[PDB]
Design an enzyme around this catalytic site. Structure first.
Site, mmCIF file in Angstrom:
data_model
loop_
_atom_site.group_PDB
_atom_site.id
_atom_site.type_symbol
_atom_site.label_atom_id
_atom_site.label_comp_id
_atom_site.label_asym_id
_atom_site.label_seq_id
_atom_site.Cartn_x
_atom_site.Cartn_y
_atom_site.Cartn_z
ATOM 1 N N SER B 226 18.379 71.200 -22.788
ATOM 2 C CA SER B 226 19.011 69.979 -23.271
ATOM 3 C C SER B 226 19.776 69.251 -22.168
ATOM 4 O O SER B 226 20.539 69.865 -21.398
ATOM 5 C CB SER B 226 19.957 70.248 -24.441
ATOM 6 O OG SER B 226 20.672 69.061 -24.762
ATOM 7 N N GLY B 228 21.691 66.593 -23.139
ATOM 8 C CA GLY B 228 22.587 65.809 -23.987
ATOM 9 C C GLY B 228 21.968 64.549 -24.568
ATOM 10 O O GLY B 228 21.062 64.619 -25.409
ATOM 11 N N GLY B 231 18.159 63.350 -23.500
ATOM 12 C CA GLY B 231 17.022 64.037 -24.107
ATOM 13 C C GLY B 231 16.892 65.469 -23.626
ATOM 14 O O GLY B 231 17.856 66.229 -23.677
ATOM 15 N N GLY B 257 22.563 71.938 -31.530
ATOM 16 C CA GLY B 257 21.832 73.062 -30.941
ATOM 17 C C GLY B 257 21.081 73.855 -32.012
ATOM 18 O O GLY B 257 19.899 74.150 -31.875
ATOM 19 N N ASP B 258 21.785 74.184 -33.090
ATOM 20 C CA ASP B 258 21.223 74.923 -34.217
ATOM 21 C C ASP B 258 20.086 74.154 -34.888
ATOM 22 O O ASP B 258 19.069 74.731 -35.280
ATOM 23 C CB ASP B 258 22.339 75.221 -35.214
ATOM 24 C CG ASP B 258 23.441 76.053 -34.598
ATOM 25 O OD1 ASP B 258 23.095 76.895 -33.735
ATOM 26 O OD2 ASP B 258 24.641 75.865 -34.952
#
Ligand SMILES: Nc1ncnc2c1ncn2[C@@H]1O[C@H](COP(=O)(O)OP(=O)(O)O)[C@@H](O)[C@H]1O
Lengths: 310, 314
Positions: B226, B228, B231, B257-258
């Site tokens: 990631s 942020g 992308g 994140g999950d």
């Protein structure tokens, strides 16, 4: 020959001693103390530590209700709770760099059936006991006269009531004709009731507790925290002078004080002995990290340094 | 139906208590009326998102005591299937105080898992493996577990050809990376990626390519990094992708994140191609960041975001 403690809004209390509280960040803690609490269960656990006959009642519900029952079962503390459909609450205390930051949940709403049902249950318990200690907030859903209703029932039976509450809830009791045996507002709470500036002079304090509000209340014991206590038993006034000590955790100390008072009331102890036991248990607690916990190996030593004079 | 199902693992769940206050008064009493208590843990956020997107999912991990019962009750109410291993210790609380734009958290270490429970869960897990086709593992190990515990779990999955999507960090991650039984997917963000390597944060394509191809990350099929708001950058086997993403208005990015893990695991389960996997993952991460709730997704906006994402082989 037994004490009834009433905790209508009990709590699983969680204590978080932190080296420092970091706002807007993560604070990690290891082992944490989670206790059967709310003021009334602090009283209960201390009375159990000293060794007096005690039965706890009040409302409990949900998983946190079972956690409280479990904590009491493990210490052999008797209980006869009325089970509700709502859920018992948490409260948190964060202890950080001398500060004491607490978050108190409102708690469950009690319904019409549970509220009436509890009164009936209380009547049966009253048969069980020879003293009732009532602590804390009325939970949501109960009618404002609920404690007055309970005390009227105690008076009808001649069972003394030690009442540990504050603000609007205590104001409601003081204005009703059925009086508790003992009340315990600190100096800050005392003058709040009078809508008047706080004044620690002696003549202002006698004037304060002789005000019409407190008529027909046998004991008025005014917590002065570390400076001690000021007390009126009928027409007699006392100043309770206490030593300086090293305070670890002062929360639950007002409740420890209630344990002492109620124990002295049950055993018909004299004015000096009641006041000394009270402030002693209040001190022992402030010295323990755990709330509602007392090291009785230090009881005699502190009790001996207390002077009751005014 | 009687193995098309995802297993999520939450070995250290929590009963998360959220207190939204007007302000937090320090060294004073704060009264709250609207407390929210939820079944928490990264793996449970994953489980919830999977349930929303409609993938068949089963939750496992360790629970104990009255707080463990609270978690099961919460999942029952949500109609989420679970098969936790029960321990004698008590499930922890975690606290979130929301005040004046701040999120102040108190995180408990939680229970210790004894040797019998540790061995018991492993046997339990071997049985669950028979009825799943993907495992998503999230979060750190609870106290008492051998440091090798995730490697033990991943070995069991390898033995059955069940792909593992792994979302942990720091030394928990590095221990897995140093073992021979590899996860199928890891997703360290760009800062974590270079900390793991003990290098500075170089956001150049050549550096990313090199960092992702270091021997520390050998044998791992998908590495999804990631970046942020910009992308993601990813390696699949030997191919590199840049995933470019629209600028959108962020409410709460916590749990994103999950959500991308849910997206990745759903895509793995369905054998989606490389572009579709990366677009699903990033879209769910975006939909969560648009939401005030954490681990929550408005699928009414899915199609519109998904169609904007570009995946480029670089
Ligand atoms: N810092 C302290 N030092 C010594 N004694 C204390 C201290 N705090 C509390 N106590 C004891 O406990 C009693 C009740 O204290 P109080 O401040 O009313 O309790 P709480 O902190 O629960 O309101 C006091 O009369 C005193 O004997």
């Amino acid at each position: 020959h037994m004490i009834l403690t009433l905790t209508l809004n009990p709590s699983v209390d969680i204590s978080y001693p932190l080296t420092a509280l970091k706002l807007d960040d993560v604070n990690r803690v290891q082992e944490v103390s989670k206790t059967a609490g709310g003021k009334g269960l602090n009283v209960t656990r201390v009375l159990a530590q000293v060794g007096e006959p005690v039965l706890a009642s009040g409302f409990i519900g949900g998983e946190l209700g079972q956690f409280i029952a479990k904590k009491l079962d493990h210490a052999d503390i008797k209980h006869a709770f009325y089970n509700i459909k709502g859920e018992t609450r948490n409260c948190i205390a964060i202890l950080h760099e001398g500060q004491q930051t607490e978050i108190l949940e409102q708690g469950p709403e009690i319904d019409n059936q549970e509220a009436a049902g509890f009164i009936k249950h209380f009547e049966q318990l009253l048969e069980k006991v020879e003293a009732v200690a009532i602590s804390g907030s009325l939970p949501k859903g109960l009618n404002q006269d609920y404690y007055a209703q309970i005390i009227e029932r105690c008076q009808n039976k001649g069972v003394p009531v030690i009442l540990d509450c504050s603000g609007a809830t205590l104001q409601t009791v003081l204005e009703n004709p059925y009086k508790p045996t003992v009340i315990k507002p600190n100096i800050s709470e005392l003058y709040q009731l009078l809508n008047q500036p706080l004044d620690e002079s002696l003549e202002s304090l006698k004037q304060a507790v002789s005000q019409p509000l407190f008529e027909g209340i046998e004991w008025i014991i005014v917590s002065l925290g570390a400076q001690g206590a000021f007390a009126k038993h009928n027409h007699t006034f006392y100043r309770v002078n206490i030593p300086t000590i090293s305070v670890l955790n002062p929360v639950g100390s007002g409740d420890s004080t209630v344990a002492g008072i109620t124990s002295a009331i049950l055993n018909h102890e004299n004015d000096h002995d009641l006041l000394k036991k009270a402030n002693t248990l209040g001190m022992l607690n402030a010295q323990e990290a755990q709330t509602g916990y007392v090291n009785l190996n230090n009881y005699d030593d502190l009790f001996n340094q207390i002077e009751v004079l005014v």
